[PDB]
Amino acid sequence: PSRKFFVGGNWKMNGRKQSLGELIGTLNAAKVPADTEVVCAPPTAYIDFARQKLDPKIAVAAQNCYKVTNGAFTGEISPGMIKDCGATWVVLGHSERRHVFGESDELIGQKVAHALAEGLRVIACIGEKLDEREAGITEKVVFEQTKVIADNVKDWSKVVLAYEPVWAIGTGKTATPQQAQEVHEKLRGWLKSNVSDAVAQSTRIIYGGSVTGATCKELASQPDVDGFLVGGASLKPEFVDIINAKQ
Template sequence: HWVILGHSERRWVFGETDELIGQKCAHALENGLGVIACIGEKLDEREAGITEKVINAQTKHFADNIKDWSKVVLAYEPVWAIGTGKTASPAQAQDVHDKLRQWVKANVSEAVANSVRIIYGGSVTGGTCKELGGMKDVDGFLVGGAALKPEFVDIINAKQ
């Protein structure tokens, strides 16, 4: 069983903070659940050039509460792309995923950086998944509305 924590809608609608989300992460893992840890920047943060600062801070709150990374997946969800029809370019997604992996290597361990899955969750569609899936550090997808459409099979097969 898995739980999604830190999703942008929970942060926005319910005002969940990085601190609370980190605590929820610890609780979920202690109770045997796997955690899909969502991180991502808003449009104004991307435009201000602070994407890396934002995702590093969010990731730190998760990392501070994780003892065993074997049941953790990191999900980069650029908030500016969710439900807007906008998608990060494959190069933008790869850049953030690479920076995430480097942060994990520097702040957790090289072994965890090499093994943790980092998935992309910003309005993935059958039309965008192939190119995104071809990026070195994009290990899969966190799919929303597209999971209800026939094109979902294209997303499922994108990393094969």
């Protein structure tokens, strides 16, 4: 075994063909350690574009999808369309989906089951808000979120778990590497007693809080932090430094 280090770049709702072309040019030229698995999530308008321009060494993810293959869902896309555009991953349950756009755990679990049935790999996102953390219910929230995902997973070899400390995002608060490690350790424990030891040992649990070229090595060194889901830094050459966080 030994868990392959995993770096996802979530571009969110940023970029146009020219600017993303330049970003992609920089990534294509960058040294990608073979020990690292890199995945970029473009805006949904540019999934096809990104896959055409990006070197095969980098995988492409959709930022969201829906839970059936086709239907009367104006504004949505399905896993079949994601695969048809050459992407192999989808991000599900991202904090912005949950807390800006109100996606339920129930919906999120249905999307996970559908995406996996359709042959996609999934970066499944969980995390607690500031009120939840300050109420002492971090474990309750993240465990129930993880439970719904697990209920809808049959092959954990296709899943990466991303912990987003939403309490430390846009709140003025910040999370230390020990605090991150603490959640990741709890999460791996959860997997061990609720799914299997094999699943606990093999599953990447990546950190989706604030990470830079300056903080990434210390965070990556944490024994249960298996890499990153990067936000704003994924749009900057510094993403390369995060890819090289274990070098």
